[PDB]
Amino acid sequence: DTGCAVSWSGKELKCGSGIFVIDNVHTWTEQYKFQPESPARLASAILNAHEDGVCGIRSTTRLENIMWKQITNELNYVLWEGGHDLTVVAGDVKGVLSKGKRALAPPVNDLKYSWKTWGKAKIFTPEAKNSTFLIDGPDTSECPNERRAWNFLEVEDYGFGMFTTNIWMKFREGSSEVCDHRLMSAAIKDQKAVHADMGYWIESSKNQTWQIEKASLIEVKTCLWPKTHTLWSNGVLESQMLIPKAYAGPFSQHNYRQGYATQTVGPWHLGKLEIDFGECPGTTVTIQEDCDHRGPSLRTTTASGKLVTQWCCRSCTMPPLRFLGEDGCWYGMEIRPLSEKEENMVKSQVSA
Amino acid sequence: DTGCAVSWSGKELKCGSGIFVIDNVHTWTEQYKFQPESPARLASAILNAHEDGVCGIRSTTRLENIMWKQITNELNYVLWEGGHDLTVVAGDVKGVLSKGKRALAPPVNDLKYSWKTWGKAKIFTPEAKNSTFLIDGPDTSECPNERRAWNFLEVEDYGFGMFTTNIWMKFREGSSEVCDHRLMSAAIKDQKAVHADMGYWIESSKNQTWQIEKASLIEVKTCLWPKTHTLWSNGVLESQMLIPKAYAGPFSQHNYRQGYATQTVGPWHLGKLEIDFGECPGTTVTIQEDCDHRGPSLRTTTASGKLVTQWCCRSCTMPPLRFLGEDGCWYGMEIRPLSEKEENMVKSQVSA
Amino acid sequence: DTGCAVSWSGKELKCGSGIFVIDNVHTWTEQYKFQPESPARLASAILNAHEDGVCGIRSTTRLENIMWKQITNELNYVLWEGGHDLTVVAGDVKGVLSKGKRALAPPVSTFLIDGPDTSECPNERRAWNFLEVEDYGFGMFTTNIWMKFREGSSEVCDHRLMSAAIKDQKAVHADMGYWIESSKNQTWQIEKASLIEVKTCLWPKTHTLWSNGVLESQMLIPKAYAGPFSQHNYRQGYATQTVGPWHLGKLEIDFGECPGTTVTIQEDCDHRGPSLRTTTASGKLVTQWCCRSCTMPPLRFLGEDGCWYGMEIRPLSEKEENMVKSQVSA
Amino acid sequence: DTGCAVSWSGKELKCGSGIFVIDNVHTWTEQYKFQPESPARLASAILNAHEDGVCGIRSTTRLENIMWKQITNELNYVLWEGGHDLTVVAGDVKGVLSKGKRALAPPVNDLKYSWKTWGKAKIFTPEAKNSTFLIDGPDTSECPNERRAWNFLEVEDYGFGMFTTNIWMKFREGSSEVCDHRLMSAAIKDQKAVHADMGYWIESSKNQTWQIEKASLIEVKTCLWPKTHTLWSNGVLESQMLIPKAYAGPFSQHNYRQGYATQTVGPWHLGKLEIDFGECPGTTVTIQEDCDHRGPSLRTTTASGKLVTQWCCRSCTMPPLRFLGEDGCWYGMEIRPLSEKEENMVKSQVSA
Amino acid sequence: DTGCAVSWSGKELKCGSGIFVIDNVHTWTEQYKFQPESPARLASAILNAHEDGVCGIRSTTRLENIMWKQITNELNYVLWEGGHDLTVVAGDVKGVLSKGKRALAPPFLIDGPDTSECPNERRAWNFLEVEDYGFGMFTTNIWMKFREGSSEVCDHRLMSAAIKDQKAVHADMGYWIESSKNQTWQIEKASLIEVKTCLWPKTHTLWSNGVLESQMLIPKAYAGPFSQHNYRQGYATQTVGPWHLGKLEIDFGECPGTTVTIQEDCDHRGPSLRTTTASGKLVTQWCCRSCTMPPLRFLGEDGCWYGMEIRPLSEKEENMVKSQVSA
Amino acid sequence: DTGCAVSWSGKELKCGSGIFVIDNVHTWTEQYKFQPESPARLASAILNAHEDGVCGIRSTTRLENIMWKQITNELNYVLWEGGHDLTVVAGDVKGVLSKGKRALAPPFLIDGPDTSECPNERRAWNFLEVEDYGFGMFTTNIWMKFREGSSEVCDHRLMSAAIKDQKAVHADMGYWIESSKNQTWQIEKASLIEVKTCLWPKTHTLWSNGVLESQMLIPKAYAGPFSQHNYRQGYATQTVGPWHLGKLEIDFGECPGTTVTIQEDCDHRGPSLRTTTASGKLVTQWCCRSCTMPPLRFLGEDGCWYGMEIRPLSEKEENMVKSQVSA
């Protein structure tokens, strides 16, 4: 990547060729766009899956959800043109991007269509009912996660441009639990590391030791971070990774904070998050040994709206771990309350 | 690092904030310039080490030898005006930057000198006093490597500018065999990784498999690559690293090529190197199972100057491993000669 | 122009001032908009043209069709106010931008703007190539072009919209809908082409590199389809593709093999003939083709309905009676 | 060339991919620098040519004269240490880059040397012995242009960088009178054309007609402009090219002006030039039918300093053609003075 | 600000670290964009001001007006959801940004033509200030907030000033005042996209001592720098200039076909007059008492105007276009 | 100036046209160099000046002493060419570039120590002036000439001053004064490669109104800007600071291994003292009467000093290191 850049301190201007790992969470421009295979191939794959027994699709990233919500009308029109009963319904992402257990195989015997691009102001075919293919949406029991397709698309090549850039997708050749590696990055220089993809930005630095310092999560995935794109992958213990392994956290020793264990019962149900180390406004945390053990992460403000003032921690390190959700301010699993009572506050909706 | 860059394919232009890992072997500008502590501190440390029993100094990087060569005169002037019976001789680096077994400790009660910076009107002291403190040079027996200092400097901040930038060094608090981590970097994005350094530039890519593809070494160090700056460093066998662990090769699985093992007896005595996979001009390599076992690396040109045309490997992979130096073109340990009486060829001077 | 650019190899970053010929087929932004003179002058012009025999017009560029589609509504209110009994009918483009033999004049029972081939309004009574640029807005996030009437009849494409550049070992003949690339690998020959449309006007020779000693029976893109009159518009072993898949509209000329197909060089093959698709009407892929005296990799057209080969490549393990041939005038 | 550029009017910004032709004549600092093959090969070629009769070298561009002047010392070193006697002297350039009739073929053997680069192992080489190989210099008669090499180098590839980039040269395989096509450019957009070069920048434009409007020469070559890099090269008469064919003028109809013809006897002996269409300071030109015929170009000011004020042209069109050299302001071949006569004023030394 | 720049002469490319003052008046694109605080607070504040006895607000800069026009619909929607009887109308601006006398407090015609139903004495003005700057390259966002107190001074986080060799400039989001030294330090040109009425802060002013509020060409009332660079030889303050136009372009020169001569007997100082009469007759002979050439030349939507000292000698005051502002 | 630059926060990249004030103390390139008017003219000026009764000159800028040392030998050779009984030596200056009370009229010790044979009372000073710049990227020349008359003001063609948002700067080729706002405008840093004595012109000074000469942290006598940005809370003018060092570095922090506390029963205001004794022992306890933290600190060549308002607590001032200027 030929170009120029200024250092972190602003004292240098170095030009050359190498690898530039850019923040795509605070993206300076318009976001990437996912473009699918074709109206004919996707319809054939969906029809074959419905023949097999798959009742829907569960997305992997928010960009894929945008693509699915975008191509739904054309998919429905293509399905209606074949004179067979099936309806595709596209929902919204609410919380953690859950995972299915099925997949869409590359369809042989492609259907009949005349176009290869997307979008020509089609007609809204009336819902034929009696057969639906739910995409995303709320967690129901008629189409559980055990019969949904998940993690079957992958990058085939990037596009061109400066503001609007397209990414072209295609089906996978197998079933994998690992995240798509062509959307991910990792970099280290001097005393600053980073793990980045389209929806994660985990920043790490050295101050007498290497540990995580920031994390901006505009989505919560469930696939695995590939180890080919991970710094310092040796000797990693799964009980030490701050961002859990189950939520696409790097299998790295840069993903670590001293005094804290894995945050499995954090406020992951929010979706967008902001991991930072500090104190929520109006609260004080003190390290005292006469404290309770770990438990679900709690919000500083009760459902009524009263702010709890005093919190105590047993063996963590200041400043305390703090999550910035949309509704309020949360603490980690090691920071317990002593001002108010635990039974009268909001805890993490995630299952223990 | 805030800046802009044009991607590898040259069809995009992305601007933002992140980490830009730049090739420093091909600088585009002037090289970095090491700047030592002070004429008073260095002379005191050298005198204390000489009293303790340290005989000389071995450079860790080719950028440190230049600093020693430019500060030798001021060191000698300080020692002479302090009335001390010692002289400092600065040699040159030829071959591998060998490893010493001692270090210079930080000094207390520094010497006396006029200024703090480097460069003032001085005089040339006579080469005398019958006591020499050798810096680098050829391998001798009056000053063996068992009594030499090595790896006792580290970065404490950077300079400013675009063409010429200074790096200010200090003294290590302890002793370590690991390379200084403030001069190193590593990055990965999409399907291209890199392990950069002041004199190392290892490139890797994915074509059905992650394996090394290029390496430009303008020096051959002997410290260890820190594992905090390594990608994919789990499940690594030391028998498979193409660049050996003893020559500051990354402890990674991107440091790997299929069909080859660790190249312990390569042409490392050259210094400058260019590792790439291909054919030396005018030769050919073919797969045969009657070939003999791997041995020391051999050159395609004999001592007289004639060319060897027929080569064969046992179970290697094509294209073959090829070392390029100032002498000529070399092959890896697996490729063997088939036409020119191996007992009459130039072999690597690395101890077997 | 003044700015910086990273070279093709990506090893240099050169800044300065000069001329920067940019790909406009892949715009990096939104496409240009043609802005006509005024709602009243066009109505008078079309009324006068209909008075003396002109029954319709043909667009010269795909942008002019968009302009006409946008403007037809306002050109009618007035055209039915004044009491004149005439209504202009719009239309779309499918295939090549065919040629006309008439032209509108500056101002002092239907009119068809583009459409399919109809005997009611033949092309010989249709205006064509009468609009030209008067200035630009050439920037980011929005662009507009102001058009005006042409004075005399001409068969030459409007030169304000065209470009051409050569540096080192790479040439290019750019346009609003054309992008022809040339390169030197032991010789100068065409390398790529990205036709987002197909025109019928002539490429002006003021915007052409290497215009001397050119034979019309060697130009890969025929001069009847706005192909440059250049020796960079040439591939070794091939002649002018007078009969190709031009009926598609969008094309992409490149050299290679369509997936699941192989081409060899044997002399026991049928002679040069119309271009054929790789899939029959049923949809069965043909996997054996041969060429008489062509060169590899073979010429290949990539339309929206499949993959095609040039006139110099014919099938051997299949009969052309069951193949789809190019629907152009042979 | 992916990048961004500000439009001619300065009110717009456009980014994209294409070809960016840069003015190398007025470009702040020098942007390109020639690099020869190797000290051994050039000396061997010089000996092989001297063994056949070639007694010198003429430069094709002014960026090659600098290279010769900067490498004329290691050549002497190699020749002296080889044992044979031959001295190489590198002169300067005056006026037009005249044309030679010989060339240097690539050597079949080579002379022994221990360096593949330039800038080492030189003392003074105090050996001439009247065996001189004159490079450039003045027009002498001991070694005339009939026995002197010219136009034997061509570009191998370009270097890397941002401000100064190396161009790697090599020996041509066959003789040719055409300039090296790999250093040239040409571009047209809307109504602005240009024919660029390393020392040429010829501009054209349309105002009711396509004709030349401005030229800027920092050297006067004598090779031929290749027609592969020439816009509108059909139906061209050699009698109307404003810049003659013998001086590397494009064989184009953009190299044209109304009312003028080829300027074969213009002030081409000055070297640098600035062709413009206007009036020299304080001078008047009119069109008269009784003016004399064509004639050589003349300066406005006599050697004493007498500024002629009355001029006339028989068929030219205003503004008149003028040359802005170092000494003063000149006119074209079709402008004659009404005052004085062509007997007490300076003509152009170029003549037939 | 680390970066590179090419000098005025065009011959030098100097790179370094320091402060880069950039012309926001003449830009490639829209360089900044105001961003309000929140639709909730911005409705409670408006409601509380309504029961406080105000009937609208006057914009301070031509970006605050755009922000109000862009968020007025959401403000109306929130207020209507709150169950109230208030309706906010986001009007336009006609020339000068006249100042209000009230303010909005932290926890309804906006702009528009002057109406006696809602006078300026019962209206708010200059209550928004910068909180932070956004990231980006072309569309940087600026975050607004409320002021605890009240002041007549402009917001100082949107203003600049610079001097180097002999070239000064006083710049902000809508002003670009230039100066230079030609045997004297005096103004050279200006480019006012808008016309404000707040005070230019003295912390962002060069050469702020020994300044009399009768020689500044741009008056103290219209946000003119309190500087000696805001000065021209022979002139005085242009309090009755064509400030009603809005956009302006101050320059020194001669409009086509006109001539100014210096005589003592000429008419005394008065309001500005346009070069063309109401019908369109072009006056081609003017005069001045003690002016220095080139004369004050305002350029806007009306073609040309002249300063308060360039009077017509071949024309009478009976039929001329005069400056709208009254003294 | 046209180019691009990243902001101080490093989160935005702005391009456009304006004025770029670049730090020249940290040049990013080679240092500037002066060029004399004419080798022959200087000799005639020296001849008729020493005939007029001046015993040399005093350099005002460290970039002028370089030129004098460069051309002293050629000037002396020119003097000898005519057989003139005069000798010139170009010495070195360390510390303050003290002021001379004479001038060098257009058509003999240079610098050095405080020689009693040629006092500053009859030595020329401040008689050059820039007339052109030229071109160049890695190296640029400066063409100097002679000044027409007496003037105790530094040459203004070498200076700069800029402000933007909440960060000002006062710069020339030997000074780099930085200012900022954190609840108030006060000086935060300073880089002095030299110590001059001419006056900073007020044409290149931000916020020059209502300035008391006793509050300027960098005194008026040492080319301190006549500005309210040249001010720190809780201090006064540092007239007796360590100005003899030559190169200084004004910063607000703590010298290594030392502490400061605020106590009411503290000594009065006097000369500056170093953290190390005359022998080398370190003082680790200081107190101030009314200072604000962090304390003033001059990071000089030979150590780490404190301001005139800071007094030791665990050491006696009778035997310490004390400033050598007007003590």
From Swiss-Prot, chains A, B, D:
Topological domains, Extracellular: 1-352
Membrane topology: Peripheral membrane protein
Intracellular or extracellular location(s): Secreted; Host endoplasmic reticulum membrane
Carbohydrate attachment residues: N130, N207
Coiled-coil segments on the chain, per record: none
Post-translational modification: N-glycosylated. The excreted form is glycosylated and this is required for efficient secretion of the protein from infected cells.
Disulfide cysteine pairs (residue numbers): C4-C15, C55-C143, C179-C223, C280-C329, C291-C313, C312-C316
Function: Involved in immune evasion, pathogenesis and viral replication. Once cleaved off the polyprotein, is targeted to three destinations: the viral replication cycle, the plasma membrane and the extracellular compartment. Essential for viral replication. Required for formation of the replication complex and recruitment of other non-structural proteins to the ER-derived membrane structures. Excreted as a hexameric lipoparticle that plays a role against host immune response. Antagonizing the complement function. Binds to the host macrophages and dendritic cells.
Assembly description: Homodimer; Homohexamer when secreted. Interacts with envelope protein E.
Protein name as catalogued: Non-structural protein 1
Source species: Dengue virus type 4 (strain Philippines/H241/1956)
Lineage: Viruses, Riboviria, Orthornavirae, Kitrinoviricota, Flasuviricetes
Stretch of the intact protein here: 775 to 1126 of 3387
From Swiss-Prot, chains E, F:
Subcellular location: Secreted; Host endoplasmic reticulum membrane
Segments on the Extracellular side according to the record's topology features: 1-327
Disulfide bridge map: C4-C15, C55-C118, C154-C198, C255-C304, C266-C288, C287-C291
Glycosylated residue positions: N182
Modifications after synthesis and translation: N-glycosylated. The excreted form is glycosylated and this is required for efficient secretion of the protein from infected cells.
Topology in membrane: Peripheral membrane protein
Free-text function comment from the UniProt entry: Involved in immune evasion, pathogenesis and viral replication. Once cleaved off the polyprotein, is targeted to three destinations: the viral replication cycle, the plasma membrane and the extracellular compartment. Essential for viral replication. Required for formation of the replication complex and recruitment of other non-structural proteins to the ER-derived membrane structures. Excreted as a hexameric lipoparticle that plays a role against host immune response. Antagonizing the complement function. Binds to the host macrophages and dendritic cells. Disrupts the host endothelial glycocalyx layer of host pulmonary microvascular endothelial cells, inducing degradation of sialic acid and shedding of heparan sulfate proteoglycans. NS1 induces expression of sialidases, heparanase, and activates cathepsin L, which activates heparanase via enzymatic cleavage. These effects are probably linked to the endothelial hyperpermeability observed in severe dengue disease.
Record note on quaternary structure: Homodimer; Homohexamer when secreted. Interacts with envelope protein E.
Name used for this protein in its record: Non-structural protein 1
Full-sequence portion shown in this chain: 775 to 1126 of 3387
